[PDB]
Amino acid sequence: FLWRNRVGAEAVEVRINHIRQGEVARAWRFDALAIGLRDFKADAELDALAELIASGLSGSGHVLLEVVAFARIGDGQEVFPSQELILDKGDKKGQKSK
Amino acid sequence: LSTASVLAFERKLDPSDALMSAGAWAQRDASQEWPAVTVREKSQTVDVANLPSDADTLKVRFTLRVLGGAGTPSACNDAAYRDKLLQTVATYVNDQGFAELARRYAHNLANARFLWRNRVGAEAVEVRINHIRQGEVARAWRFDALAIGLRDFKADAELDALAELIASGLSGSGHVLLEVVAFARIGDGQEVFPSQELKTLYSVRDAAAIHSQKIGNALRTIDTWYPDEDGLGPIAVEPYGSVTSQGKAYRQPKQKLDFYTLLDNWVLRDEAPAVEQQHYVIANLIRGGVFGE
Amino acid sequence: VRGTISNRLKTKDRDPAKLDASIQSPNLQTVDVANLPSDADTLKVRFTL
Amino acid sequence: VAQICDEALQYAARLRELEPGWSATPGCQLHDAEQLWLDPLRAQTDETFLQRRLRGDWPAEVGNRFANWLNRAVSSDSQILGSPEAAQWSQELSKELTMFKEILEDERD
Amino acid sequence: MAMDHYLDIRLRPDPEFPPAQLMSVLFGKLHQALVAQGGDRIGVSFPDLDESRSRLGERLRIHASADDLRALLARPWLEGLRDHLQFGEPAVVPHPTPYRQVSRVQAKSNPERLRRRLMRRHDLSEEEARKRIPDTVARALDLPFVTLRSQSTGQHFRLFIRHGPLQVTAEEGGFTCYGLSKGGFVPWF
Amino acid sequence: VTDPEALLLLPRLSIQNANAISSPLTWGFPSPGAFTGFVHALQRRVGISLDIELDGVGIVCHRFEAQISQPAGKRTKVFNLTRNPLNRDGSTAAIVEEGRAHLEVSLLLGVHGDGLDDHPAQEIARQVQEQAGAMRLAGGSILPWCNERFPAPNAELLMLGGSDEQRRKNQRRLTRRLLPGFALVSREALLQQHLETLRTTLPEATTLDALLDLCRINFEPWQVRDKPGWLVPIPAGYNALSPLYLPGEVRNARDRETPLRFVENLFGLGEWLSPHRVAALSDLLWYHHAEPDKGLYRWSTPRFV
């Protein structure tokens, strides 16, 4: 889900939680430097999360998640948020290009 | 046969915008506490980058790293073109390594060109750099006084490993971070300027700074072989590569040795130029751009 | 927002060339959205009957 | 379509006489580049470099406006060019853009 | 006119910007070369200027006499430009001396200097200072120089350059601490 | 009968109190023969001393109102009139109706003369422009120089001599000062092949323009037919049916040293064109000729495309 901010980055690691109520029900700590982006291999901590969202997508006990990534990118680098369609109301200064 | 209509590349060598502060010579050891060059309006109002008398030197924090994978296009339209551009750049690198490009980008790191008006007239400059992949440092660095050069370039028995680590990062065998700073003891009462807005100078918050594309310019002065001459020196690499200082269209579009004119003949009709025209080719291949028709 | 052509294109003309052609023509769509504040997790709806 | 471009040129000529005050004002952002063909009177507040905002001789984005008008005139479909007059619509649009470039080659000048 | 030495200079090409601020920095470096140490055995001028062209040049000639300019143009006083440039060498002067030289010549014809004095002494409004300051006594000028880096006005302005009497005779008048001309001949061809 | 040595434009020939009807079957813009006679009289009072020669005219017709009114919302119009002075009996005059319009035009001509051969350019152009505003053109006086004089001095734009690409850019250096109007050219070949193409019902000749100032439609057994422009009849010459006469044979001529022929009107059609849609500006002149073997005293635009 980090489109360009993942690639080039040195080390990333992902904090996923399950929200039962206004609290934390179960933790998940991952690392995308030890799992791929091309192969989808069976793992040892996230198959329980797979069964969690399998029960969620069947309706049997809902699940509210908090997927949070911690991407080490470099002190003061250039992140990539998304880009809007721009209307032509701007002059030569005033955020006309991007 | 035609190439791809829409065609693009992500930029490598992605820098940070360099916020500025003043400081003390022989305080590289703990340069961590220094206040910036705070901008003031006072009367036409003008912009003076003033430096204190108890700290006459300069401090320019920015950083640099490498995406790697110049062979992969960002968004190439066709399918009978990617499979030959991949092998073209790959068997370029394995045919002839880009170690000469690694040398020349290390020569752009070697001279303090990224500060344009801020360079000229100091006591002595000492560009620093450090090897980073996590929060601790790997191998520290120092530069020299004689080995600066305003146009000249030379290799060393300490700078060569830096050259080939930039090469191996740009190859794809371990990407690392560089954090750049350059000394300048330029003076009290010197209005030494960063880049400026559309006279509003570019003010990253409670400081003054340079843009990252303009700081990319003076890290990409590579193109020596424009077919007129090379005694004025190489230029920053771009197609139709020209500048406002010369004000003339270097790489004039009426000969085969243009970028856009030999590249479609170097993918399709296989017109291979020399080594030091191909460093221009790959050097503005690693600036990206909206390419194709 | 923009997306690709998820229309059921009528098979009097449903050809691969037009499907590849209709991608570099994007969908100029500016829409509206209604999110919560990110500091909150409830929705209050009040009216009078 | 060339007659419609000539009618647009006639509309530009009709606008080229009823403009006593042509300069920057409230509602002139799109008319700062749109004032190329509709060239207003020479601004007194301009300096010796008055050929950039009040003397703009850059009728190259007028080709972009003609391209926008050609794209918004009739929706060119992805499969309406099987004959030699479907891409010929784009050839006629390019001929109209060439005529517009020749007409606005000396618009602000 | 009286020099017995010289030194060549010409900056190299580069990406950054044109020779306007470079000519202003050269005028400041000349005012710090002749002025910042004091000395009258020297010449100074921009004889590669275009008064009919509104430019400054792409070359420089800051030379002096034999004993004066034999030990002056090989130091870091004009430093910062020894990597993408080059200084001259020790050579003799010509048998016929070109007796001419350009120095700081310019004017002021605005309502802030003269009208500034006429409002800080006379103290009146713009009526008397408009009746005693017409539009046909002076205007903006175009000297043989460029915009200099002096932060009293933001955008660059007219430089300070103006020629004088072009002779061929010798000028045996020792100049001041500016390297300019006071009425005689200096080394300038 | 030839393309000129040089053109001559007069950008706002603002005229006034013109003749509207100009023929018994129309009321709009006046006859082009009025303009050909205008430039023959200009040639008579100028080019016998300045040695030029004028053949064709160019109409552009910037703006055109007419003193007309709508009676009670009918599908017709009327004319505004002028008060005739008192009759000798002193009750009222025999009131007679005619249309009087107030139009705008700019005339470009065709010169076979020495405007830059033995005389200078803008001297000839300025004297002709200064001398043109002392004569009437369609029964109406020219509105003289005013705030419209400020673009009125002109060049004397050559055609026959110059570079080919600068022949193009000189004639469209003349087009840039001619935008908001609509030029008048004839459609003689369109008259011919549009009566001959549409001869699948009857061979009548005067029914051509009598069946074009209207919305022709053979509708659905709502689709308005493809109008090719502005189909409108014009007075296109003078057929002299009866033979020649003499100044002593038929008395009450104007001068008694020029012969008399009773004449009738002739109706072609003249389309209105923007000046951009032409071949060249020398291809739109209303010339003049007389064929006294026929009755045809007919003016024309040779090579309108």
- The DSSP-derived string for B174-219 is ---EEEEEE-----TT------B----B---TTS-B--HHHHHHTT
Distance, in Å, from the CA atom of B167 to the CA atom of A25, rounded to the nearest integer, reads 47
D16, D39 in Cβ contact below 8 A?
Answer: yes
Please give the span between the terminal C-alpha atoms of chain E, in angstroms, as a whole number.
9
Instruction: Flag if F276 and D13 touch (Cβ within 8 Å).
Output: no
Instruction: Flag if E149 and B191 touch (Cβ within 8 Å).
Output: yes
Partnered with residue B21 across adjacent β-strands are B36, B59
Residues ≥6 apart with Cβ < 8 Å to B283: B101, B104, B220, B222, B223, B237
- The verdict on A96 touching B (C-beta cutoff 8 Å) is no
Residues followed by a gap in chain F, C→N > 2.5 Å: 221
DSSP one-letter string for A11-61: EEEEEEEEESSSS--EEEE--TTSS-SS-----SSSHHHHHHHHHHHTTSS
Instruction: Flag if A85 and C28 touch (Cβ within 8 Å).
Output: yes
User: Can you give the length of chain C in residues?
Assistant: 49
Enclosing H/E stretch for A72: strand A64-72
Take residue B180 and report the two structure tokens written for it.
Answer: 């750049």
Neighbours of chain B (3+ CB pairs under 8 A): A, C, E
**Contacting residues of B for E18, CB less than 8 Å apart:** 244-245, 247
State the virtual CA torsion across D15, D18, D23, D29 in degrees, nearest 10. -40
Closest CA to E87 of E177, E12, E180, E189: E12
- B171 and B107: one domain? yes
Closest CA to B180 of B168, B162, B197: B162
Q: Dihedral of CA B118/B119/B125/B129: which sign?
A: positive
User: Any idea what DSSP says for residue E71?
Assistant: S
Distance, in Å, from the CA atom of F25 to the CA atom of E89, rounded to the nearest integer, reads 97
- B35 and B150: one domain? yes
Take residue F258 and report the two structure tokens written for it.
Answer: 């020029």
Interface of B with E in 99-128 (CB under 8 A): 111, 116-117, 119-122
Enclosing H/E stretch for B20: strand B19-23
Q: Cα dist. D22→D10, D37, D41, D62 in Å? A: 19, 12, 5, 18
Distance, in Å, from the CA atom of F160 to the CA atom of F139, rounded to the nearest integer, reads 34
- The verdict on D29 touching C (C-beta cutoff 8 Å) is no
Domain boundary among B221, B254, B285: B221
Take residue D109 and report the two structure tokens written for it.
Answer: 């000048």
CA distance B143 to chain A (A): 23
Neighbours of chain D (3+ CB pairs under 8 A): A, C, F
User: Any idea what DSSP says for residue E22?
Assistant: H
- B18 and B83: one domain? no
CA distance B176 to chain E (A): 29
Residue F210's φ and ψ, nearest 5 degrees, are: -80, 0
DSSP one-letter string for chain F: ----SB----TTEEB-S--S--STT--SS--HHHHHHHHHHHHHHHHHHH---B---------EEESEE-STT-S--EE--------SSSS---------EEEEE-----B-S-TTTTS-HHHHHHHHHHHHTTS-SSSSPBP-SSGGGTT------BSSSS-HHHHHHHHHHHHTT--S--EEEE-HHHHHHHHHHT-SS---STTTGGGTSS--------------S---EEEEEEE--S----TTTS---SSTTS-----EEEEEEEEEE-GGGSS-GGG---EE---TTSSEE-EE-TT--
A15, A49 in Cβ contact below 8 A?
Answer: no
Any long-range contacts for A29-35 (C-beta under 8 Å, 24+ apart)? Answer: A32/A6
- B77 and B188: one domain? no
Q: Cα dist. E183→E46, E102, E159, E180, F227 in Å? A: 17, 11, 22, 9, 85
3-class secondary-structure state, position A70 = strand
Instruction: Flag if D79 and C22 touch (Cβ within 8 Å).
Output: no
Domain boundaries, chain E: 1-189
User: Any idea what DSSP says for residue E77?
Assistant: G
Enclosing H/E stretch for D94: helix D87-103
Distance, in Å, from the CA atom of B134 to the CA atom of F51, rounded to the nearest integer, reads 94
Distance, in Å, from the CA atom of B162 to the CA atom of F185, rounded to the nearest integer, reads 80
Distance, in Å, from the CA atom of B92 to the CA atom of B274, rounded to the nearest integer, reads 12
Take residue D9 and report the two structure tokens written for it.
Answer: 């040129």
Distance, in Å, from the CA atom of B287 to the CA atom of B74, rounded to the nearest integer, reads 12
Other residues' Cβ atoms within 10 Å of the Cβ of residue D106: 13
Enclosing H/E stretch for D99: helix D87-103
Distance, in Å, from the CA atom of B227 to the CA atom of B274, rounded to the nearest integer, reads 12
- The verdict on D83 touching C (C-beta cutoff 8 Å) is no
Take residue F304 and report the two structure tokens written for it.
Answer: 């309108």
- B48 and B91: one domain? no
Say how many domains are in chain B.
2
Enclosing H/E stretch for D89: helix D87-103
Distance, in Å, from the CA atom of B286 to the CA atom of B71, rounded to the nearest integer, reads 9
Partnered with residue B229 across adjacent β-strands are B226
CA distance B1 to chain C (A): 18
Partnered with residue F14 across adjacent β-strands are F104
Enclosing H/E stretch for D63: helix D61-73
Instruction: Flag if A77 and B179 touch (Cβ within 8 Å).
Output: no
User: In the block, which residue shows the tokens 């050559």?
Assistant: F158
Given in angstroms, what resolution was this structure solved at? 3.5
D31, D65 in Cβ contact below 8 A?
Answer: no
Other residues' Cβ atoms within 10 Å of the Cβ of residue E104: 16
3-class secondary-structure state, position B82 = helix
3-class secondary-structure state, position E78 = helix
Closest CA to B242 of B261, B217, B209: B217
* Contact residues of E toward B, CB < 8 A: 12-18, 21, 25, 79-85, 149, 151-155
A33, A10 in Cβ contact below 8 A?
Answer: no
CA distance B207 to chain A (A): 15
Distance, in Å, from the CA atom of E40 to the CA atom of E175, rounded to the nearest integer, reads 5
Other residues' Cβ atoms within 10 Å of the Cβ of residue B18: 28
Q: Where are the alpha helices (DSSP H) in chain E?
A: 19-33, 114-120, 126-131
Other residues' Cβ atoms within 10 Å of the Cβ of residue B130: 16
Strands A64-72 and B14-15: unpaired
Measured between CA atoms, the residue of chain B closest to residue E18 is B245
Distance, in Å, from the CA atom of A45 to the CA atom of C17, rounded to the nearest integer, reads 44
B241, B284 in Cβ contact below 8 A?
Answer: yes
Distance, in Å, from the CA atom of A92 to the CA atom of A88, rounded to the nearest integer, reads 11
Please give the span between the terminal C-alpha atoms of chain F, in angstroms, as a whole number.
16
Distance, in Å, from the CA atom of B275 to the CA atom of B280, rounded to the nearest integer, reads 9
Enclosing H/E stretch for D90: helix D87-103
Instruction: Flag if E149 and B236 touch (Cβ within 8 Å).
Output: no
User: Can you give the length of chain D in residues?
Assistant: 109
3-class secondary-structure state, position E187 = strand
Q: Cα dist. F78→D80, F98, F140 in Å? A: 52, 10, 20
By what method was this entry solved?
cryo-EM
Other residues' Cβ atoms within 10 Å of the Cβ of residue A56: 15
User: Any idea what DSSP says for residue B256?
Assistant: T
Q: Show the domain range for B190.
A: 11-69+98-221
Distance, in Å, from the CA atom of B180 to the CA atom of B129, rounded to the nearest integer, reads 5
Distance, in Å, from the CA atom of B181 to the CA atom of B21, rounded to the nearest integer, reads 11
Closest CA to E56 of E24, E28, E31: E24
Per-residue buried b or exposed e for D61-87, using 16+ beta carbons within 10 Å of the residue's own CB: ebeebbbebbeeeeeeebeeeeeeeee
Type of residue at E60: L
Instruction: Flag if B245 and E17 touch (Cβ within 8 Å).
Output: yes
**Contacting residues of D for C13, CB less than 8 Å apart:** 79
User: Can you give the length of chain A in residues?
Assistant: 98
Q: Number of residue pairs across A and C with CB atoms under 8 Å? A: 6
Strands F287-288 and F299-300: antiparallel
3-class secondary-structure state, position E182 = coil
3-class secondary-structure state, position B90 = helix
User: In the block, which residue shows the tokens 């004025």?
Assistant: B232
Distance, in Å, from the CA atom of F305 to the CA atom of F286, rounded to the nearest integer, reads 13
- B35 and B130: one domain? yes
Take residue F265 and report the two structure tokens written for it.
Answer: 């009107």
User: Can you give the length of chain E in residues?
Assistant: 189
> How many angstroms separate the most distant Cα atoms in chain C?
57
User: Any idea what DSSP says for residue D69?
Assistant: H
Q: Cα dist. F55→A29, C44, E126, F50, F285 in Å? A: 95, 87, 64, 16, 8
Distance, in Å, from the CA atom of F304 to the CA atom of F106, rounded to the nearest integer, reads 18
Domain boundary among B221, B253, B279: B221
Take residue E105 and report the two structure tokens written for it.
Answer: 């010549």
Q: Where are the alpha helices (DSSP H) in chain B?
A: 82-95, 99-110, 159-171, 212-217, 259-267, 275-283
Type of residue at F28: G
User: In the block, which residue shows the tokens 């673009």?
Assistant: F151
B184, B120 in Cβ contact below 8 A?
Answer: no
- B199 and B262: one domain? no
Residue A45 buriedness (CB in 10 A; 0-12 / 13-18 / 19+): exposed
**Contacting residues of B for C17, CB less than 8 Å apart:** none
Distance, in Å, from the CA atom of B81 to the CA atom of B90, rounded to the nearest integer, reads 14
Instruction: Flag if E149 and B199 touch (Cβ within 8 Å).
Output: no
Interhelix angle F32-50/F121-132, nearest 10 degrees: 130
Instruction: Flag if B116 and E17 touch (Cβ within 8 Å).
Output: yes
Distance, in Å, from the CA atom of B118 to the CA atom of B106, rounded to the nearest integer, reads 20
Residue A19's φ and ψ, nearest 5 degrees, are: -100, 105
Residues ≥6 apart with Cβ < 8 Å to D87: D81
Partnered with residue A44 across adjacent β-strands are none
Distance, in Å, from the CA atom of B74 to the CA atom of B10, rounded to the nearest integer, reads 6
- B31 and B90: one domain? no
Residues ≥6 apart with Cβ < 8 Å to F44: none
E11, E22 in Cβ contact below 8 A?
Answer: yes
Distance, in Å, from the CA atom of F13 to the CA atom of F15, rounded to the nearest integer, reads 6
Residue in D3, D13, D17 nearest the CB of F277 = D3
* Contact residues of C toward D, CB < 8 A: 13, 15, 17-18, 21-22
Take residue E27 and report the two structure tokens written for it.
Answer: 């005028």
- B4 and B54: one domain? no
Residue B226's φ and ψ, nearest 5 degrees, are: -85, 135
3-class secondary-structure state, position E29 = helix
Q: Dihedral of CA A47/A51/A52/A54: which sign?
A: positive
For C1-48, the three-class secondary structure string (H helix, E strand, C coil) is: CCCCCCCCCCCCCCCHHHHHHCCCCCCCCCCCCCCCCCCCCCCCCCCC
Domain boundary among B221, B243, B277: B221
Does the annotation mark E31 as catalytic? Answer: yes
Distance, in Å, from the CA atom of B241 to the CA atom of B284, rounded to the nearest integer, reads 10
Take residue B227 and report the two structure tokens written for it.
Answer: 């077919």
Residue B167's φ and ψ, nearest 5 degrees, are: -65, -50
**Contacting residues of C for A85, CB less than 8 Å apart:** 2, 28-30
User: Any idea what DSSP says for residue D41?
Assistant: P
Residue E128's φ and ψ, nearest 5 degrees, are: -70, -35
- The verdict on C20 touching A (C-beta cutoff 8 Å) is no
Residues ≥6 apart with Cβ < 8 Å to D89: D74, D76, D81
Take residue F253 and report the two structure tokens written for it.
Answer: 């001529």
User: Can you give the length of chain B in residues?
Assistant: 293
Distance, in Å, from the CA atom of B282 to the CA atom of B284, rounded to the nearest integer, reads 6
Distance, in Å, from the CA atom of D62 to the CA atom of D9, rounded to the nearest integer, reads 12
Distance, in Å, from the CA atom of F46 to the CA atom of B202, rounded to the nearest integer, reads 70
Distance, in Å, from the CA atom of A75 to the CA atom of A61, rounded to the nearest integer, reads 42
User: Can you give the length of chain F in residues?
Assistant: 305
E1, E170 in Cβ contact below 8 A?
Answer: yes
- The verdict on D75 touching C (C-beta cutoff 8 Å) is no
Other residues' Cβ atoms within 10 Å of the Cβ of residue F284: 25
Closest CA to A11 of A30, A28, A29, A33: A33
Distance, in Å, from the CA atom of F185 to the CA atom of F303, rounded to the nearest integer, reads 10
Distance, in Å, from the CA atom of F47 to the CA atom of B23, rounded to the nearest integer, reads 88
Type of residue at F248: G
**Contacting residues of E for B119, CB less than 8 Å apart:** 80
Residue B110's φ and ψ, nearest 5 degrees, are: -75, -40
Q: Dihedral of CA F202/F206/F212/F214: which sign?
A: negative
F270, F186 in Cβ contact below 8 A?
Answer: yes
Q: Number of residue pairs across B and C with CB atoms under 8 Å? A: 3
- B25 and B141: one domain? yes
Take residue B95 and report the two structure tokens written for it.
Answer: 């045919």
3-class secondary-structure state, position D14 = helix
User: What fold is seen in the domain E1-189?
Assistant: Alpha-Beta Plaits (3.30.70)
CA C3 distance to own-chain centroid: 7
Q: Which residue in the list E5, E31, E63, E122 is annotated as catalytic?
A: E31
Partnered with residue B223 across adjacent β-strands are B235
Closest CA to F236 of F24, F29, F32, F27: F32
**Contacting residues of C for D79, CB less than 8 Å apart:** 13, 15, 18
Take residue B238 and report the two structure tokens written for it.
Answer: 């771009």
